Amino acid sequence: RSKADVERYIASVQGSTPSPRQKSMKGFYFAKLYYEAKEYDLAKKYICTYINVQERDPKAHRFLGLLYELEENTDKAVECYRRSVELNPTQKDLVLKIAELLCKNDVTDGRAKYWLERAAKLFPGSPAIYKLKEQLLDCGWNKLFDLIQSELYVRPDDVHVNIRLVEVYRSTKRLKDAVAHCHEAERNIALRSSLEWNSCVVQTLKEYLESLQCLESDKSDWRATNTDLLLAYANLMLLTLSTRDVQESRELLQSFDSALQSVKSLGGNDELSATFLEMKGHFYMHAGSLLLKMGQHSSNVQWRALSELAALCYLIAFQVPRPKIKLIKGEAGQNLLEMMACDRLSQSGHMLLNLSRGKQDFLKEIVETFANKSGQSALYDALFSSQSPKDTSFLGSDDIGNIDVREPELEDLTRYDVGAIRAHNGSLQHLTWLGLQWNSLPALPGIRKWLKQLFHHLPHETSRLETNAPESICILDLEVFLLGVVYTSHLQLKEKCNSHQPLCLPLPVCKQLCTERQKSWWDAVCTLIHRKAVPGNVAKLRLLVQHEINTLRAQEKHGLQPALLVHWAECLQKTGSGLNSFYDQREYMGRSVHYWKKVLPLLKIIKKKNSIPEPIDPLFKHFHSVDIQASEIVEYEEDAHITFAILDAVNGNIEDAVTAFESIKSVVSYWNLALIFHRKAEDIENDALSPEEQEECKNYLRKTRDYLIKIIDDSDSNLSVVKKLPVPLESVKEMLNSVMQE
Amino acid sequence: KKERHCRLTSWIVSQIGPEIEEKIRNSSNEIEQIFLYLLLNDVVRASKLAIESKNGHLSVLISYLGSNDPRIRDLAELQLQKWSTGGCSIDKNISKIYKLLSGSPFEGLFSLKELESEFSWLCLLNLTLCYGQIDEYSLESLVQSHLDKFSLPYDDPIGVIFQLYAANE
Amino acid sequence: KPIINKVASVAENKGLFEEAAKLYDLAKNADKVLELMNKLLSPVVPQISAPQSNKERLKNMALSIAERYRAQGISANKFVDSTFYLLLDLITFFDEYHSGHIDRAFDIIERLKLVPLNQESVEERVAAFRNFSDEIRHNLSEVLLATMNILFTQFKRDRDSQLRSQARTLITFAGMIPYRTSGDTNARLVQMEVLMN
Amino acid sequence: YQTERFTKFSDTLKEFKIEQDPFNIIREFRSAAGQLALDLANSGDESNVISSKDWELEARFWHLVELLLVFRNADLDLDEMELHPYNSRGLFEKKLMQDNKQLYQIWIVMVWLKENTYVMERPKNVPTSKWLNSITSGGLKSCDLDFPLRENTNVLDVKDKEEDHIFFKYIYELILAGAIDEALEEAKLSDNISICMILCGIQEYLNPVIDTQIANEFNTQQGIKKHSLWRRTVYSLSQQAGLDPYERAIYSYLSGAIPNQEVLQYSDWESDLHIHLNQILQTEIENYLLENNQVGTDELILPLPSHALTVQEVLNRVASRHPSESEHPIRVLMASVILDSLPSVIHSSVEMLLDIIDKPYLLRIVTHLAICLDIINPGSVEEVDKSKLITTYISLLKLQGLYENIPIYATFLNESDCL
């Protein structure tokens, strides 16, 4: 548009509605286009005339206030917002604005204070609220300090406020207190995950090292503060790699390597030495992740060479032993250090594998070719510019001795993951990554154990299942949730690459793998459970969780594709069928039967080749990639009937369970048939009782033996059956040994 | 169709205006006045007088005149049959008003046809056109419906025009 | 049902497809509606959709038949039906391509899995072309060129290796496929790949 | 067994974290509380009737939460409605409810309020026909509702009035419950045709033919064109005494007014709040219509108030009118949700742990709500507040000896490390 387009429309509606009232009632819609044509002295008079006839419109009044804001006329802009706010109270964002503008222009009047109080209760403890609290105070040093401290009491997890405390300490040049709080705050799990906080941590420490106060004071605690810098570097590196661009991440590596080189000389056998050990591993791991980031964008020749280089890095990291935990002063410190160790082994572990699955014993070649010191120079070359002095760089001086070149064992990997769930504050990013990394492996992850490590004493299943109130959240709900998040995530990435490996991406490099909806839910239920919510936001968080519960439980209007339900059903059956206790068996089998009972009606319509009613804004994205086909229907009906029988057996309907189990000659039905025949024998096997009954009792133990043998016979013959076993093969053999010795 | 209908009925009201206003001048009974206001197609003043003369329920009922709500139609007729089967006594003008709500004020069994002798033929035709069953009928077949119930004077030309209008086919 | 097919049948025999479709669609005979709709679309797939054109007037009726056939769960045999919804996707691919929305248009063609972009998919995609409706094979020439010209434009704006690899893929596919104007097309495809390097 | 409770809630959380939509959590929370509400209620010590009501209340809270957060959050913005002046008032009303979310929220809340309203059982032995007693005594010269209004109420037999009372009270309860269809059925079937007809005036005018954009929902014109009239007519009728107090109450509700004292004195927090939101709503629509010249001057028979309250203020007034009820801790949350000041109140009751410990439901509810919130709206409740809440609730899972299900709640902090 131009000046002609808008001023010519004057004659357009002037010739359609010529009376003064309708001429002025079009002022807002006249002014609508002058704001777009960069006319603010003109747009002002157009809207102001519509306000002369439509004086009760909150939109028009705000629009003039927003226009007076561009004019920087605070007194006029504020008044306009006031009118729109008093007309319509639901305009929260305007209550902030008024409070925001009143504190910036002049604080002498209490009106600025009043509007700030309201702004606080509309946005409980938002980042802007404190900003305004500091602004109002600005219009003395001790005064500011008390605000931050009183603010930190109730908001200790606020990144910005804690940063300001370090800045206030630094302004009074009492850096020892700055690091002291910086050290006591590196125990906070939330702050450790904040990119901007860790950046502040790196500076305030370095400043203290060079500070005159560090030398004069003493050289005893010098080592203590030095440890935190390395820790900060590791956290900062993890975060910078994910969010920041290629250039910034590489630059952080040089500071990390400089610190490592400056630290190794002291050595010793204390926390600092142990910290250097674990941080050393992180360096290569992140360096490997850093390497893979560059190659992804680059060509194929560089990719293989870089991935080759990265594989060595991850390998170096994985080899590094578990740090000496006992050697730390406190329980918090040592637990932290171990947590990071698990994270290192887990992340590097999966990467090592995903890179080694590409070829046969691909790992062996990597070591045999690049473990040579020539690789050390090829690594420094690709990562850094050769101009920097290669003497004080830790990378160039490390003694790469006897690389284990042994691929990781799954069992070890599981306990690394489980121990590192709390590494990144259980971000759904973290878990959705792990869940995907295990999606390609033959052994499945202990999700139920992950959740127990996060939400302690959260019941497996809530008694009050009738309602969806989120006080009834259960580890099953979460377990059911993560399954969909990963099943959804995998399909989304599968679709992406098809248009354009998905497993090979390292955790920092990849972007959000879940929908912001899913992430919002997890963050909500997490903040709620851990009791780090906000009294004001409690009701909102609570409802946000409540919204999705009815889907995790397949209730009214669940956005669940039939394939995802089936996946939930079987994934819970086999998860539960391998559990030892009855409580857990019952619960997981119950939910599995539940989801089954919801699918079968859909499968029957799908069985006759009809259409499923597609969802409305589903929580778990539908995909035709995994849409159920008639070829697989009869199998699910069968696999479901097993899940029914299993629950019947656990409840007590043995007669119907056996009748069903025997109907289908499946490997799993044997283990169930055997397991329940053994129980009927063992209890009655040795007490004084009718001899005829004793013979019938022994007869069952004879059936147990036979079914276990059928399992092993069919198992050893075919591999596909080995994977169908509801429990491990060695566990089946274990029972048989005891069964026959009975 | 709505436009045409509205103009025709505004015009008829222009014509019958003084006749009815005279009649309202001479009435000694409030409910009768309410009815006459309905004769001038003034639902609001009927409702108001009802309100004022303490006839409030009727007043509410009145507000339906000119929406053709078939529910209200069959309900009004029902009330009328129940009265006209026992109903020891119902006020002479309330029944008239209910008959208007019935949508078939002559076409009926509580019929306003006898008002043939008290009102201009045009006045009654106004009743058919305003209440009468506007939506279901075309203007023509509606007018025709009315004419089928009453012979007009041969010599009257505004009569003739209505007949030619309704005669359509 | 019979006469509507009788009247639809003759008008079909008189090349009045746009009418025979409306008539067959009146009797809810989707086997014939989608058949004819396949013929009316294939010629106009790569064309420029402009106001009041023959593309708009046919695309807009095809979409009005796609909704009413999904909302009512109607469909012809998968051969006729698959081709019908496939053309509708392609018509969207060129409407986005002719508008300059390169990124958006590239994403659509990727979903269809019609043209291979990674060397591994060449074997299966080549086999699929053999049994795809000739109303699709006809427009293969314009699809390869648009897709190439898409990668071609994105190149002038690692990623370079990825485009280069995909460029190659299109060529080998086109090399193994005998199709319309394979001569001029296969040559142009190779030239555009050379300029990339 | 009942000391199972926490399981149910915990159970729901399990299922959610494990099928990796979150609105189901809350839906289940609701059902859970409702199920429990039934347990304590059926056969119980009269110490249980109290905590039974605190569960029913619990449940209603989860429901309200679901409704509002579903509407607010599942907001994916649809297509704007383009009206013309020729369009009926019906369409303008619809447009209003589409475009103004602040006000639709009021609707949502009223719907919830109605949902949970008590209605008496249908009156038995209802008589064959209306005012039969007066007719039989002789002395009804007219059989129309307005006859005893035209001249002294002494006309109507006592028993007839007593029955009219039974009727109008029942109709009123049904109206407050949203049971408009049932009210029309009762009117029809109980020989109250004229009252029925009155209830039909509730609808604004639509014509499927003119108002095209609803030619789906309707095949026939319906509703009444001169509604501002209707409304004054009803309101005036409502102010005319010598009518039964419940009948007047009905007309009050229909006109967007506040029913007479005799009836209003028995209305509780919910009932009263409902009444006043109805008022806000009615006033706001009629104003919307005036700002668009869809009201005709002839119809402004009478003055009705034009100034709509804010939900904030209605709540404040109803609060001061029902302090006991107002102050009940889940009903405070109810209001907090209604005003959206919800994390606001979370952080608040958090600081009340630093007479919240005295009532058992509270600490649980706030925690599970906070969880739900941050699930549905990541960021919602301050990280710290989640920590504090779960910390304290977990220590109660310990005091109850249900360590079994603590990991589930852990899944929200790296602080979990410390367990």
Order of helices and strands of chain B: HHHHHHHHH
What is the radius of gyration of chain B computed over CA atoms, rounded to a whole number of angstroms? 16 Å
Structural class given helices, strands, pairing of chain B? mainly alpha
Choose one word for the global shape of chain B: globular
The percentage helix of chain C is over 70%
- Structural class per helix/strand content of chain C? mainly alpha
Taken as a percent bin, the fraction of beta residues of chain B is under 5%
Terminus-to-terminus distance of chain C: 61 Å
**What can be said about the biggest beta sheet of chain C?**
none
Descriptive overview:
- The structure is cut from a larger assembly and holds chains A (742 residues), B (169 residues), C (197 residues) and D (419 residues).
- Chain A has helices at residues 3-14, 20-25, 27-34, 40-53, 58-70, 74-87, 92-105, 110-122, 127-138, 141-154, 159-171, 175-185, 189-192, 195-210, 212-217, 222-243, 246-264, 271-297, 300-319, 331-356, 362-370, 373-383, 394-397, 410-420, 428-437, 447-454, 475-499, 516-529, 538-552, 562-577, 582-607, 630-651, 654-663, 667-684, 691-717, 719-724, 729-741; one strand at 536-537.
- Chain A is 71% helix and 0% strand.
- Chain A has 742 residues and is mainly α.
- With 169 residues, chain B is mainly α.
- Chain B has helices at 2-26, 30-39, 43-52, 56-62, 70-83, 92-102, 121-130, 139-147, 157-167.
- The longest helix of chain B is centred in the N-terminal third of the chain and has 25 residues, at 2-26.
- Chain B is globular and about 45 Å long.
- Chain C is mostly helical.
- Helices cover 74% and strands 0% of the residues of chain C.
- Chain C contains 11 helices and no strands.
- The longest helix of chain C has 20 residues, at 78-97.
- The N and C termini of chain C lie far apart (61 Å).
- With 419 residues, chain D is an all-alpha fold.
- In chain D, α8 (158-176) packs antiparallel against α9.
- Chains A and D meet through α13, α20, α25, α26 and α27 of A and α1, β1, α2, α3 and α17 of D.
